[PDB]
Every structure is written in structure tokens, then in C-alpha cells.
Amino acid sequence: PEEITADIPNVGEAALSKLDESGIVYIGAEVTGGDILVGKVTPKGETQLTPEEKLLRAIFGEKASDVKDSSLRVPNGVSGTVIDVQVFTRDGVEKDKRA
């Protein structure tokens, strides 16, 4: 399953600045074309890292599971204010913060 976390590979902290810990834009934030609307991560498999490489990953914190982003972005050339947000969860173990 893909994840909604805010940990998104090789994105500048500028893009995260407007996202809460859950990964949803703040209500009232002003956005512009190309900004990341919401954070999503694509799973990566069969990394098969070497044990020393695994240790390096552990200390550094690099995530083998991620490395790819499916995050939605604002369409090109449209800019406005986020007035409302809704969340629909088919299975979810518990209601999410935003929920």
C-alpha cells in the first residue's frame, strides 16, 4: 500500500512547509501552480541492500520502502486558496488526525 506520510524523497523543505504532520495542506494556505497538494509515497521492492549498506541506511535513516513519490501537485497555472478538505477512508484502522 502507498502511504500518505510527510517523508517524501528529495523534496525541499519549502514544499513541506505548508503541509501539516499528516500530509494535508493547511486550511487557508495560498498555493500556486506546481506546489505539492498532498504527500504520497510509492512503495519500492526488492532493494536487497548489503548488510553494511543496511547498517548505513539505519544510521542515516534512509528508507528502502520509499524512494518514489506519487504526491499530487497543483495543476499548472492555477492558483487559489484551499477553502475545504474532505477525507474518505474505506478501511483505516482508526480515524486519521484530519478525520
Partner 1 sequence: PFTLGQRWISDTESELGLGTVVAVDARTVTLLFPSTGENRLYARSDSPVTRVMFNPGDTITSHDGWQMQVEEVKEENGLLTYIGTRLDTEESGVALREVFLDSKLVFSKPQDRLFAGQIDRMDRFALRYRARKYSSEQFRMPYSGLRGQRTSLIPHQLNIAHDVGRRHAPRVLLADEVGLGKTIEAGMILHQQLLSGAAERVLIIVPETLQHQWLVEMLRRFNLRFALFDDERYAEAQHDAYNPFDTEQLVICSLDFARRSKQRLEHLCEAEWDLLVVDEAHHLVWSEDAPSREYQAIEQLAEHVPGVLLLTATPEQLGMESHFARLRLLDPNRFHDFAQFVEEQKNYRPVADAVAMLLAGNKLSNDELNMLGEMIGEQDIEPLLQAANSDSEDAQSARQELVSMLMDRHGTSRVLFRNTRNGVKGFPKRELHTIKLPLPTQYQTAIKVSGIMGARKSAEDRARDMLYPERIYQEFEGDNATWWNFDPRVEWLMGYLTSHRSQKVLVICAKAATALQLEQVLREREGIRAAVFHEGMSIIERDRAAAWFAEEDTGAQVLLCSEIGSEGRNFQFASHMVMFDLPFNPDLLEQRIGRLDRIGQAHDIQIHVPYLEKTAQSVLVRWYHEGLDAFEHTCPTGRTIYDSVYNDLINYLASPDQTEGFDDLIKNCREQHEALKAQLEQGRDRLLEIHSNGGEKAQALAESIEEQDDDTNLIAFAMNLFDIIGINQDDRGDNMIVLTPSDHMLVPDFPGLSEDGITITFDREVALAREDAQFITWEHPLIRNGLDLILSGDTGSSTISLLKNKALPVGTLLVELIYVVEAQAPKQLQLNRFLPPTPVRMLLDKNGNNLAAQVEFETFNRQLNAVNRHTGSKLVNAVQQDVHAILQLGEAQIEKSARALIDAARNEADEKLSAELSRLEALRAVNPNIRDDELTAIESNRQQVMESLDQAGWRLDALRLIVVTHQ
Among 46, 48, 50, 52, binds partner 1 (CB under 8 A): 52
9-14, long-range: CB within 8 Å, 24+ apart, which pairs?
9/41, 9/66, 9/67, 9/68, 9/69, 11/36, 11/69
| DSSP conformation class of 48 | -
In contact, 22 and 97? CB cutoff 8 Å: yes
CB of 38 to partner 1, least distance (A): 19
66 contributes a contact to partner 1 by CB under 8 A:
no
In the list 1, 13, 80, 81, the residue contacting partner 1 (rule: CB under 8 A) is 13
Query: Which of 3, 35, 62, 69 is close enough to bind partner 1 by CB under 8 A?
Result: 62
Binding stretches for partner 1 (CB under 8 A): 10, 12-14, 17, 52, 55, 59-62, 67
